[PDB]
């Protein structure tokens, strides 16, 4: 896992481009993805 | 008397602006229109066309 560097991430099918940073948001145990108002990926939980 | 009326009128403006939420309707409408146009433009990427 690499943080604070612009990389290509494939977290089981996200297949998106962006820089990954630590977040204070808390997900539900079953929840994996994250979306904003515009239905764009905003935060993803590390599978490991 | 005029000084007191002026002060009380400004205080009433203070109270009316603080209480009523729809006071800044023009600015809120402009901001909402711009944000909604931006949201529609962004959502247009998800359409097949
Ligand atoms: C996933 O596997 C690694 C390697 O064995 C381990 O260090 C890690 O704790 C595992 N993840 C969880 C949530 O246990």
* Distance separating alpha carbons of residues A43 and A21, to the nearest angstrom: 9
- Please tell me the experimental approach by which this structure was elucidated: cryo-EM
Rg of the Cα trace of chain B? 20
**How far does CA B2 lie from the centroid of its chain?**
31
User: Which structure tokens are listed for B36?
Assistant: 């909604």
Question: Which helix or strand (DSSP H or E) is residue A8 part of?
Answer: strand A6-9
Planar angle of CA B9, B10, B11, nearest 5 degrees: 90
d(CA B30, CA B11): 27
Nearest to A47 by CA among A23, A4, A6, A13: A13
B47 interfaces chain A, CB cutoff of 8 Å? no
Tokens found for residue A24: 């204070």
Resolution of the structure, angstroms: 2.9
8 Å CB contact of A40 and B43: no
Residues A12, A24 contacting (CB under 8 angstroms): no
Contact yes or no for A37 and B39 at CB 8 A = yes
Distance B31 CA to ligand 1 centre (A): 47
Give the residue carrying structure tokens 């402009």: B30
């Amino acid at each position: 896992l690499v943080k604070n560097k612009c990389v290509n991430f494939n977290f089981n099918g996200l297949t998106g481009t962006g820089v990954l940073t630590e977040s204070n948001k808390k997900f539900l145990p079953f929840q994996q993805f994250g979306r904003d108002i515009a239905d764009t990926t905003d935060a993803v939980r590390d599978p490991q | 008397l005029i000084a007191n009326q002026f002060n009380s009128a400004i205080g009433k403006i203070q109270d009316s602006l603080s209480s009523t939420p729809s006071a800044l309707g023009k600015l809120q409408d402009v901001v909402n229109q711009n944000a909604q146009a931006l949201n529609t433009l962004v959502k247009q990427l998800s359409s097949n066309f």
